[PDB]
């Protein structure tokens, strides 16, 4: 069963009706001077994918409203963190506090210990998958 | 048609064949409703298991598209690392174009080295897909390659053949009577609410209800440890100093049908189903493991369960259909 994931960009970025989507999560809404720019980038991607069959950022040229191309993304069940933003049920909630981050590190620490056990069994007072970080719920 | 035949390896793993790239490179993958990503070993992989399984070579495909997006996925039994890429995937007699998938870099452990399959094809909801990668099935529906927004699953028993996944459709022939529809309580895994687990009308576990997922990727019927412990005691299943759950091979023919109550309909699981009979040495079909979620302590209904009923996963109205295997 899926328990958790971590990945690095470049995350797919798309603009539909002025809404910016990164890793299929609502990242931000474009207004004023970026509405056209957004449409432009969307057309660029279409050309890169359908014509040039090039997914690299050199063809794509994602603008700053696509967020940092080197940010991390963690997936828990029914919960995820992209960049500094928290998303519950694929919906923005708030920016991670230093407490939320600490909770992510702890989780990574426990998942690391758990995977070690799992992929090296020839549980007997063993380990269970760690619980999702507190921020993942109310 | 539109079906994906699945092999049955010791009633423990069910996998089918898929092709990737132009021309197709074939791989065997578990059709796992317990997850949502598609991944296969690649020439970029350095783990043991990769030394003896099919490996995808992007340079042998006129349609592949690279990305530098890396991801790491961890499951209940293992983890893997890889790089995402795009290609055409042949599954269930359908040609899934522009499908994103992972080319593994690592996939540690002996389990995978001895496993008779190459990768994993996640059939769960997008919300639980690593890096939000578009799951194969969502891609089938998006490109109109399937008639209906659902798929059916039949898992053979006693190492038999005939197992299969029907993409975009339901087939009467595989079941008797009518399908009971069960609402999905939480969209991620194919999650449903378990009313009660009781044998002889007696509540042995999951009291007041609990959350459960239907997972083809799991072989046993697992549940939280604290609860499973009773389950063993309540069937005569004891543990030996070798690990395995030793239990009378006779008990099979004299035990109560543990019944899972789902949405008001009882689903009986006879000890001739929850008892693993390999030789003249029988073992339990329940496994202890705490799976904490924001929805509580999860119960996983694996093949031990699916084997008994044709299961339909309906993404159209978010429901699970059940009915006794024909």
UniProtKB/Swiss-Prot annotation, chain A:
Its main location: secreted. SUPFAM superfamilies: Pepsin inhibitor-3. It is found in: Secreted. Transmembrane segments: none annotated. Residues 115-138 are annotated as: Disordered. Keywords: Aspartic protease inhibitor, Disulfide bond, Protease inhibitor, Pyrrolidone carboxylic acid, Secreted, Signal. Residues 128-138 have a biased composition (Pro residues). The keyword Cytoplasm does not apply. The modification Pyrrolidone carboxylic acid is found at residue 1. This is an inhibitor of the aspartic protease pepsin. This is Major pepsin inhibitor 3.
Curated annotation (Swiss-Prot), chain B:
Minor amounts of the active enzyme occur with 'Ala-58' at the amino end. It is an enzyme of class 3 (hydrolase). Its EC number is 3.4.23.1. Keywords: Aspartyl protease, Digestion, Disulfide bond, Hydrolase, Phosphoprotein, Protease, Secreted, Signal, Zymogen. GO terms for molecular function: aspartic-type endopeptidase activity. One of its GO terms (cellular component) is extracellular region. The keyword Hydrolase applies. The modification Phosphoserine is found at residue 68. Belongs to the peptidase A1 family. Shows particularly broad specificity; although bonds involving phenylalanine and leucine are preferred, many others are also cleaved to some extent. This is Pepsin A. The gene is PGA. The chain holds residues 60 to 385 of 385 of the full protein.
């Amino acid at each position: 069963q899926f328990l958790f994931s971590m990945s690095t960009g470049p995350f797919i970025c798309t603009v539909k009706d002025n809404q910016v989507f990164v890793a299929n999560l609502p990242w931000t809404m474009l207004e004023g001077d970026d509405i056209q720019v957004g449409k432009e980038f969307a057309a660029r991607v279409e050309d890169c994918t359908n014509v040039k069959h090039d997914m690299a950022p050199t063809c794509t040229k994602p603008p700053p409203f696509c967020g940092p191309q080197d940010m991390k993304m963690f997936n828990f069940v029914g919960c995820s963190v992209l960049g500094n933003k928290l998303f519950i049920d694929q919906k923005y909630v708030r920016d991670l506090t230093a407490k939320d981050h600490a909770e992510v590190q702890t989780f990574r620490e426990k998942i690391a210990a758990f995977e070690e056990q799992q992929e090296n069994q020839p549980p007997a007072g063993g380990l269970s998958p760690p619980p999702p970080p507190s921020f993942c719920t109310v | 048609i539109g079906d994906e035949p699945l092999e049955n390896y010791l009633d423990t793993e069910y996998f089918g064949t898929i092709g990737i790239g132009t021309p197709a490179q074939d791989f065997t993958v578990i059709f796992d409703t317990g997850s949502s990503n598609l991944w296969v070993p690649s020439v970029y992989c350095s783990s043991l298991a990769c030394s003896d399984h099919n490996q995808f070579n992007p340079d042998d495909s006129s349609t592949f598209e690279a990305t530098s997006q890396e991801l790491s996925i961890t499951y209940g039994t293992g983890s893997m690392t890889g790089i995402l890429g795009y290609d055409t995937v042949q599954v269930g007699g359908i040609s899934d174009t522009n499908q994103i998938f992972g080319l593994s870099e690592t996939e540690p452990g002996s389990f995978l080295y001895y496993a008779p399959f190459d990768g994993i094809l996640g059939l769960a909801y997008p919300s639980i897909s690593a890096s939000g990668a578009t799951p194969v099935f969502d891609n089938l529906w998006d490109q109109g390659l399937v008639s209906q927004d659902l798929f059916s699953v039949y898992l053979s028993s006693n190492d038999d053949s005939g197992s299969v996944v029907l993409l975009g459709g339901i087939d009467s022939s595989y079941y008797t009577g009518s399908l009971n529809w069960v609402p999905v309580s939480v969209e991620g895994y194919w999650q449903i609410t378990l009313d009660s687990i009781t044998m002889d009308g007696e509540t042995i576990a999951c009291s007041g209800g609990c959350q459960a997922i239907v997972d083809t990727g799991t072989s046993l019927l697992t549940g939280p440890t604290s609860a499973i412990a009773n389950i063993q005691s309540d069937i005569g299943a004891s543990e030996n100093s070798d690990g395995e759950m030793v239990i009378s091979c006779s008990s099979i023919d004299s035990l109560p049908d543990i019944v899972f109550t789902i949405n008001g309909v009882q689903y009986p699981l006879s000890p001739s189903a929850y008892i693993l009979q390999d030789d003249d040495s029988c073992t339990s079909g329940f496994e202890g493991m705490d799976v904490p979620t924001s929805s509580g302590e999860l119960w996983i209904l694996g093949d031990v369960f699916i084997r008994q009923y044709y299961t339909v996963f309906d993404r159209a109205n978010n429901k699970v259909g059940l009915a006794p295997v024909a």
